[PDB]
Amino acid sequence: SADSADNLSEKLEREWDRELATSKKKPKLINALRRCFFWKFMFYGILLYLGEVTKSVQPLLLGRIIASYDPDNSSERSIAYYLGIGLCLLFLVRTLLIHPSIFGLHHIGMQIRIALFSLIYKKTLKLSSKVLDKISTGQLVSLLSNNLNKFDEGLALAHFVWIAPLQVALLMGLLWDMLQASAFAGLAFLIVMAFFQAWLGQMMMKYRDKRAGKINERLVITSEIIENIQSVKAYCWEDAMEKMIESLRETELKLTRKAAYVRYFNSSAFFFSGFFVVFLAVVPYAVTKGIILRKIFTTISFCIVLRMTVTRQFPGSVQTWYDSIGAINKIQDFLLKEEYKALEYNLTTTGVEVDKVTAFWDEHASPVLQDINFKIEKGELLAVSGSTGSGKTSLLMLIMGELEPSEGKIKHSGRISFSPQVSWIMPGTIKENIIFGVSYDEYRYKSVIQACQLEEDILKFPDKDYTVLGEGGIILSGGQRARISLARAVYKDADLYLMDSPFGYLDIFTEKEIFESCVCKLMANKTRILVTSKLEHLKIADKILILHEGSCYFYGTFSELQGQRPDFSSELMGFDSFDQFSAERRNSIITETLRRFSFWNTYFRYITIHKSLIFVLILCVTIFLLEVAASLVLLLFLYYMIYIYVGIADTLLAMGIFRGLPLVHTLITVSKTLHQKMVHAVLYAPMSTFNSLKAGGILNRFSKDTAILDDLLPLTVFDLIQLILIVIGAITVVSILQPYIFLASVPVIAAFIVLRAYFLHTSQQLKQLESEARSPIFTHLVTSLKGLWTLRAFGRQPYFETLFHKALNLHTANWFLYLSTLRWFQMRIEMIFVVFFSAVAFISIITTGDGPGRVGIILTLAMNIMGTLQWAVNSSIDVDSLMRSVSRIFKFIDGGQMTVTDLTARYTEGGTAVLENISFSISSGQTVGLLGRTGSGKSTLLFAFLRLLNTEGDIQIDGVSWNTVSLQQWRKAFGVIPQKVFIFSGTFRKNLDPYGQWNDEEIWKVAEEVGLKSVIEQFPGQLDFVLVDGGCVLSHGHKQLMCLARSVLSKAKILLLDEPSAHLDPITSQVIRKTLKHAFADCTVVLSESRLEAILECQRFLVIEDNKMRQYESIQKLLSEKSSLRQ
């Protein structure tokens, strides 16, 4: 196997394609995979087997070593000496064999994961357009992310399904004094514990899945709040929002608490089993014959080995192996989906023809396009219009071959260049998007970008052609994104060009220029099809097509339309001034014209009350498990004293469990408190201070830190308690038996501490790389999915495959480095442990072990100490991560006439002053407003009033200085509607009234007053309707009206309007102006405008530049000074 994506893919593709091609009904992915996997997997598997079997040998060697100190036979010093050497070598050898093999298995898991991802990516790009709208988008994201961190670890235990029975059979077969079947008492106990644990684990999974759903809901509300803190504070909404967080948190905790107990008992059960395998193991020796130390010591070491292979190594592989298989099956189901059918290019024609085409998207469809017919000559212009939904763009999908006809033929000449309704961001270099996938030629490039009028905006970009367009499209406005899409479609040389919604939400001035610049001249003599709403284009076009309800309304010459459907034509022409209508209005006009011319609980409470019931229930489980083991003992089918002693052990263990329950209760309580305090602290936080993270670390730390406290503190703490108790005992005993061991062990612990510290520093830094390399794999994926229509149209598939592989190689390189440093670290740790072991074995061998039982116990304690020690190393690592998280969390928590005198503001106490020494007056009830350049800090005046800035000077509102008024009422006076309107997700009643203070009747009254009554009636449920995704179903004008309704219900006196005109079309902007003037007849309205035409309705003006301002009492004085100062 290879170490890179390209090679890994070739091999997987060859086997997959060969089997898939060999069409034996249902070819399987699993077979393609075993043919890759098996020849490496099996080798690491056998090496691990050989490594593990060492544990089944070591106790035998000790029994003989112990015997050498017996008074029996002879004091063969030389044998004790050499056997001791052999024992320490067994430790060294398995260390040297096992770790490399584990590493190799992880290497394999990684290689397979990469091969699987590349296969899936290739498949998504070839999917049929029909199934494309049935496959939930969340499923493809989870298809790749769900096993991202599981698949590659899982192979580590896979060969244990195979090893486990070999070691169980051996250890069983090695039992000394086998017929007195202590073997069954032993196994019956362990077997029962294993099934108990399996069941418990299943319950754990049930809780994880349900909790995950609730987590996503909490996270969504959380980020919604974080990115809009200014509106929450401005609204003085505050604690209502805090309560929304609380209800989501409470829901998660109820589920978490139950999950926590599952984890608690799992761990205490583990402890319990330790005690009993040892206890039961000595029942033979108490029962008749008595004790033989030679055999007792040997017996216990073997018992320990069975416990671990039986209860942990085996079931871990079973669960892992099973889940891995299910994941593969899901991948296969995805791969076996209908394909995009390739278009056959030919030299049949020069034009475009459609022969009686009838077609539809899916079964059960009524949207069947009927009897579609075309004959377009080379170089002709086709203009198409019609009702929304009557195959306005679905026609294009037939043209490009995305949708097959059910009947009829489609003929085309050559290659097609397509520009979709919705622009594809293509994150990356802007020049490259314009000329993407093709050679750069300044002749053509300049001609296209100039003709498309891109220079007007692109030359303002900081790196010009090399300005990179990042995620979110932070560089371009929607009309600009559209403009680039056109330039891209045009730059590509094609025989046929398809323009989807080319008007681009652009200003009519540029719309005209682009049509003539591009449609007429740049595209001259090309075969063109335009989607359009403008009658002028139809007049110009050689062929006119109008669609309605799945069929042709009209197809032919412009004058033929008028002669054959004159009523349709006359109704449209009544709106003669179509250039004055925005696309939205043009669409409404045709839609109407065209449709008009149709042609447990009782006891749970008692369990909480009576702790004696809890004790009994704990004891009941213990009793039950021992009785079940008895059922397994009866396997022999094909004493009172023992009964008494085991009964005693059960009672003692039950009390031990009972004592620790308050810890679970305490743990849930603590994480709840921390989450709640952090939220409170962020809401009632100073402004500017949060700008240290700028919402990045705020969201990431808030989300991640809570998650780790909940999953790890309740887990790692119990392991630490058990490990701590074990080491205390181990050291105490050897220190007493032989003080030289202590002398020897002190430097050993010192060695481990130093290496650990160095390691963690570096590995913690490397961990950052996984996130850095991981994020872009998904950004790449999403971008490719949205761009699918053009990736196929322009033949760019291999370009993107190349990019995808480079991203994978980056990720794997960092992932791999992280893995490698960890493995090296663990190897070093184990070797240090191996060395002190040898030294200890010899301290005991060398000294006067004339009372041999003391020799025996030192040797077995040392031999079996390594299991606990490996856990201890890992637990210390987790602890350091937890403490670092705790610190990160802790860092956050441990006047009608408005009179402004000498006001000054900054974004920090250092930084820069965004405003200095401004004085300004607003007469009560006066309409006033602001003028200034974009980015002149317009919003910093509003924020200065809302007290969101580091500030100086005297502002008198509601008769008093801000200096004597707390933020809530100072801000309460101000009803502000920002350009970026905040929409709270949820029920409209709460969105409008998060406090529940207004009645439904009152809410409706205001909805009527502000013009939103029809809007709320339209949404099903009305007040109960749930609004989602930032108001993805609302006009931004509606969002502004919702804000208005809030301002009037809130009884604000100062109304602040942040350029409504920035986004709202005048057809509605005037409606809101009328509406608010009536609503605010007794209030003072302050407007911040971008144009003189809007500011014009104000009586007093504030003109701001360079952190200074000029106050005018008349628009004329403003204009006289503005002309002099128009700079």
Ligand SMILES: Nc1ncnc2c1ncn2[C@@H]1O[C@H](COP(=O)(O)OP(=O)(O)OP(=O)(O)O)[C@@H](O)[C@H]1O
């Ligand atoms: N792949 C698809 N499978 C099924 N239905 C589809 C698919 N793509 C689009 N549609 C739907 O079926 C119709 C297809 O027609 P088309 O895409 O031409 O509509 P349009 O008038 O261009 O749409 P709009 O302007 O609302 O975006 C639409 O009304 C749309 O809701």
Ligand SMILES: Nc1ncnc2c1ncn2[C@@H]1O[C@H](COP(=O)(O)OP(=O)(O)OP(=O)(O)O)[C@@H](O)[C@H]1O
């Ligand atoms: N708290 C802040 N800290 C740092 N920079 C800020 C802060 N608030 C805004 N800015 C920036 O400084 C300028 C402030 O001007 P303001 O926020 O009034 O701009 P605008 O013209 O309303 O901007 P837009 O059209 O992007 O909404 C902007 O150019 C913006 O990038």
